[PDB]
Design a protein around this ligand. Structure first.
Ligand SMILES: [Cl-]
Lengths: 392, 411
């Protein structure tokens, strides 16, 4: 599943690099990514589709570190971006703009212009007012903007019953070209919505509105010669006759989640009448998923100890009730022990802040037995370098 | 203008021209000059609330230690330092902010359950007022660092309040098993340990007596027991000079809460304990608004897609800078992030047109302090108004700086 495994010496390694070595060299907390894990997951997705025309558009928001993006860009990956910042990251990482699709409900005129100038693949439009703005901007630039409409399955996009009308509007707007349909179908409803979607592509085709690609979003869906999920399998089988509809997938978490761990150190162990607490050095500003959402992430020792385990809540170092990484974890701990939080490669560093004026941590990439720093730990004083006191 | 408008909470109010003003500066002008989204703070609002709190205790020896984490902008901190405020910090970064803002380190208390040796060393070097120690292992670490520097660390122990288990079993169980502090029954023992260590110097007790939702009677008995402990420790040679009661014991708008008054009635007999309060939201919350622009009005349910996202404000009344005449419609205000949790308000009645500017009230605390770059979005500008003057207190981040510390794979 991934390359974070214990080796013969009894400790946890990332590929061929001991995690403890990285903690020593770069300090804690620390995000560590595995190049091989990212590549193995991307290829599983890329190859599961078969010869069917497709494009994997990695969801940049999941993990947008330049090293991570560069890894995927070298494989020829596409990218799904939600801002001009993400588009600039893709370009800095060597990504191909012709393989970029731009999503998001609040795209600005400035963002649309930069994307049009870079000639991205498609704008995934979520509303009629957005469609109007993209038409205005493309006209001002004297170009034609490639679009897809985000549609919602019949049960945040446009409803199925207004889809035809909004597509006809896009078709009548002078500065837009209709290219795709975006439907985040990711089991009975999935299939039912897929048919209604294909029927819509056909009816539009009769009207001279030609959809060339279908974007099915993320939340899929590789079964491991890796095969697609029953969901994807159900779709591919219905697309033999329906061609040459290029299929676009937007995996994020599926590629990046298990490719990263957060290494943290146990500062203090505290005991109450019925509970035990391990105070760790990673806080809500470093990894917010458990606090914000109700995410359960496996927490394991870099060097497991023998003996009777005690049940601990793992809590951060500041002063918040939601400052914790895990609850009710049976572990054998001593102060100073290092832990790894699995599944921290997605929605980990991307959501990190400077809350409590804490510098963001370093991000490191392993590649066999080599280690590359891909994001330096922030220098403390840089946190307020843009600020000013009152002159009074 | 004798009829200059105000409200009980802040200086963000409408005037003769039909628009929302921040003190004597139109919010619309600031949005025009600095862009949106924008955090706008009111100097007079911060001062009003800090003074209301400072005056509530009257003549009794005290220190207000503002909770820096609520809003640690240098301009905000400087406003308070100018009034002689103290500060409660939870990291070395917050300590450095206070120093850069002109604050007095001898009025700084350092809280937090996971202070590092490095943080303790710097805090000791700057001679802060006191370390609010949350566990025995932390007490040992501070003794170690103080021992290495050959100095005496000033300490206060965070002691859970002595709730009576017979009358408040659930609260008692909750307190005793929480991650914060040391249980009341262990207080004397851990104080004796601190007393035995020559590189520690016992100065206080940190007991957040009003933080448990409790009636006046139980609060008072619990307070009496805390005071009796202080006395028993004193007779035993361990001299506590200050009591830090934490946050929440606010003011009723301008006299103190009945809780605050009961406490004061007991402290005023001896008057040998300096009282420390740690307000944060109570000082900063209403001193700020987040100004945001409506991008699109999407109708299905109605959605006003605004330019402020979860990365800007993750936590509130939402009002127009320039109210329109018409029949208000109901909207959910949602940001641009591709997340279901990316919203600022649900079901709000407003008369809107695309491009309109809105102000999100009560955004001065836990607003910018929690802002991130999620979706590679630069953090916004922070401006402070002072009468008719405008001060830029945090520049908007330049987009390319977001990945300046990063690198690609070797070639
Ligand atoms: Cl303890």
């Amino acid at each position: 599943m991934d390359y974070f495994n214990y080796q013969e010496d009894g400790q946890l390694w990332a590929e061929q690099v001991p995690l403890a070595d990285l903690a020593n060299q770069y300090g804690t907390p620390l995000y560590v990514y595995s190049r091989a894990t990212l590549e193995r997951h991307w290829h599983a997705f890329d190859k599961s589709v078969g010869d069917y025309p497709h494009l994997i558009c990695y969801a940049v928001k999941a993990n947008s570190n330049l090293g991570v993006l560069n890894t995927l860009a070298r494989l020829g990956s596409g990218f799904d971006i939600v801002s001009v910042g993400e588009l600039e990251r893709v370009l800095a990482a060597g990504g191909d703009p012709s393989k970029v699709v731009f999503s998001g409900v609040g795209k600005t005129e400035a963002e649309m212009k930069r994307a049009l100038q870079l000639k991205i693949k498609c704008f995934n439009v979520e509303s009629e007012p957005e469609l109007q703005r993209l038409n205005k901007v493309a006209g001002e630039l004297g170009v034609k903007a490639p679009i897809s409409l985000r549609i919602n399955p019949d049960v945040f996009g446009i409803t199925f019953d207004r889809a035809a009308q909004v597509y006809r509007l896009a078709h009548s707007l002078p500065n837009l070209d209709v290219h795709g349909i975006d439907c985040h179908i990711g089991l009975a409803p999935f299939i039912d919505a897929t048919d209604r979607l294909l029927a819509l592509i056909d009816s539009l085709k009769a009207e001279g509105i030609h959809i060339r690609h279908l974007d099915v979003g993320g939340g899929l869906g590789v079964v491991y010669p890796p095969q697609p999920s029953e969901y994807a399998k159900a779709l591919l089988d219905r697309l033999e006759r329906h061609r040459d509809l290029e299929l676009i997938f937007e995996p994020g978490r599926a590629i990046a989640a298990n490719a990263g761990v957060l290494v943290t150190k146990v500062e203090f162990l505290k005991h109450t009448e019925h509970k035990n607490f391990a105070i760790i050095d990673a806080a809500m500003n470093d990894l917010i998923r458990p606090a914000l959402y109700q995410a359960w992430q496996d927490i394991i020792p870099l060097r497991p100890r023998q003996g009777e385990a005690q049940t601990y809540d793992l809590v951060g170092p500041v002063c918040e009730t939601s400052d914790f990484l895990g609850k009710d974890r049976d572990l054998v701990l001593q102060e100073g022990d290092l832990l790894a939080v699995r599944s921290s490669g997605a929605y980990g560093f991307t959501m990190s802040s400077n809350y409590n004026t804490r510098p963001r941590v370093a991000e490191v990439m392993v590649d066999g037995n080599k280690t590359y720093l891909v994001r330096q730990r922030e220098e403390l004083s840089s946190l307020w370098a843009l600020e000013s006191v009152l002159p009074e």
